[PDB]
C-alpha cells in the first residue's frame, strides 16, 4: 500500500549490512516483517507485538533480527546480514501491517560488487 523512502546499499562481498526500519505506530501496529524478494517473495522474519517472533521457512532469523522500542514511542525493526556473499543481493523490504487494513512497506536494494 504505502511506501517510506529506503535506499540502495552498495556493498562489497564480505561486508555487514544493518537494515533498520521504524514506525511510530503502536495502537494500530499488527506485525512487522522482513522479506527478501528476488525472484521469490521470501519471508525472513515475522514479529507480532503480542505473539512473538516467527521465522520464515528455511531461515535462521532469530539471531539476525531485532525489534526494540524508542521511548519517544517509535518501534525499531532491524535485520542484520553478516559477511554478505555475492548471492545475498536483491530486494529486501520491511512491511508493517496496520489495523484495520493498511500496509506500510520500506524497500531496500542491496547491490553487492
Amino acid at each position, epitope marked *: 500500500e504505502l511506501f517510506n523512502v529506503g535506499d540502495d546499499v552498495y556493498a562489497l562481498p564480505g561486508s555487514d549490512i544493518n537494515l533498520t526500519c521504524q514506525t511510530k505506530e503502536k495502537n494500530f501496529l499488527v506485525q512487522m516483517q522482513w522479506s527478501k524478494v528476488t525472484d521469490k517473495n521470501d*519471508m525472513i522474519a515475522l514479529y507480532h507485538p503480542q*505473539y*512473538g*517472533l*516467527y521465522c520464515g521457512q528455511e531461515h535462521a532469523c*532469530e539471531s539476525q533480527v531485532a525489534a526494540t522500542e524508542t521511548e519517544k514511542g517509535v518501534t525499531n525493526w532491524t535485520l542484520y546480514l553478516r559477511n554478505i556473499s555475492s548471492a545475498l543481493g536483491g530486494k529486501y523490504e520491511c512491511i508493517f*501491517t496496520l489495523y484495520p487494513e493498511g500496509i506500510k512497506t520500506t524497500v531496500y536494494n542491496l547491490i553487492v560488487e
Partner: antibody, heavy 117, light 110 residues
Framework: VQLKESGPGLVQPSQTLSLTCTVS????????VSWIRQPPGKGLEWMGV???????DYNSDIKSRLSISRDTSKSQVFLKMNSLQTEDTAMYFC????????????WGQGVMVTVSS | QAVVTQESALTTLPGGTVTLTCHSS?????????ANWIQEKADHSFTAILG???NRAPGTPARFSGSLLEGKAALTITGAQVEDEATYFC?????????FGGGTKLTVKR
C-alpha cells in the same frame, strides 16, 4: 519439521490427561504450537496455544482444566487436562504456527485418547 | 465470541474454479482474524491448506489461493482437480479464541 503427538491411549474419568507434542528440527522460540481435538462425530474444538514467546491463550470453555507449557531445551509442548470427563475422549492434534502466524502452518497427525472406566 | 459459517456444499467439474468463503458473525473479516483452511479427507486426516488469510501452507498446490472478498475470507481453488474433493474447514481468530466453521463439502465430479 515433523510433529508427533504422544500420550496415554486410555485414561480413566479419574485422571488428568497429559499428552506431549514433540517438534523436530525447530526451536519453540520461533514457533507456536496449538492443540486441537475432535471427538468422533463431533466437530473440531481448539483448546489452546503456546506462542513462540511462551505466552498462552486458552479456549474459554476449558481454561479452568487446561495447562499448556513447553520445554525449549527438548523442543516439546505439553498439555495437561484435569477433571477428565468421558466426552473428552477424542482425537488430539497439535498444529504449529496455528492460528498465528499461519505461515509455516502445519498440522500434526493426531493421537487417539479414549477416556472411560 | 462469534459464529463462523461456511457454504454447506459446493460442486465443480475438473478444471473449474470454486470459491469457498468463511463468514464471521461479528462483521467484516480483517487480516487480524488470521483466517485459515484445513482440508479433511477420510480417516481423521487433516492437511493444512492455507493460513494467515493468503499464505499457502508447505506443500499446498498453486491452485489454492486465499483472499478477503465481501465480508468474509475466501479460499479459491483455480483449476479444481479430482484430488481436491474433500471437506474444507475454515477457522477464525478472535483475539484469544479460535472458532471453526462447519466445513464445506467440495465435490469435484470425476
Amino acid at each position: 519439521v515433523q510433529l508427533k503427538e504422544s500420550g496415554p491411549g486410555l485414561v480413566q474419568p479419574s485422571q488428568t490427561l497429559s499428552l506431549t507434542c514433540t517438534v523436530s528440527g525447530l526451536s519453540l522460540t520461533t514457533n507456536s504450537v496449538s492443540w486441537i481435538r475432535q471427538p468422533p462425530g463431533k466437530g473440531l474444538e481448539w483448546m489452546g496455544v503456546i506462542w513462540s514467546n511462551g505466552g498462552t491463550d486458552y479456549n474459554s470453555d476449558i481454561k479452568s482444566r487446561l495447562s499448556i507449557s513447553r520445554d525449549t531445551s527438548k523442543s516439546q509442548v505439553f498439555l495437561k487436562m484435569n477433571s477428565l470427563q468421558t466426552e473428552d475422549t477424542a482425537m488430539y492434534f497439535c498444529a504449529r504456527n496455528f492460528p498465528y502466524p499461519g505461515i509455516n502452518f502445519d498440522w500434526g497427525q493426531g493421537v487417539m485418547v479414549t477416556v472411560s472406566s | 465470541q462469534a459464529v463462523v459459517t461456511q457454504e454447506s456444499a459446493l460442486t465443480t467439474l475438473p478444471g473449474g474454479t470454486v470459491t469457498l468463503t468463511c463468514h464471521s458473525s461479528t462483521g467484516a473479516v480483517t487480516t487480524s482474524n488470521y483466517a485459515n483452511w484445513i482440508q479433511e479427507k477420510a480417516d481423521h486426516s487433516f492437511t493444512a491448506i492455507l493460513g494467515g488469510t493468503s499464505n499457502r501452507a508447505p506443500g499446498t498446490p498453486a491452485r489454492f489461493s486465499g483472499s478477503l472478498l465481501e465480508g468474509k475470507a475466501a479460499l479459491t481453488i483455480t483449476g479444481a482437480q479430482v484430488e481436491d474433493e474433500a471437506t474444507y474447514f475454515c477457522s477464525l481468530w478472535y483475539s484469544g479464541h479460535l472458532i471453526f466453521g462447519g466445513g464445506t463439502k467440495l465435490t469435484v465430479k470425476r
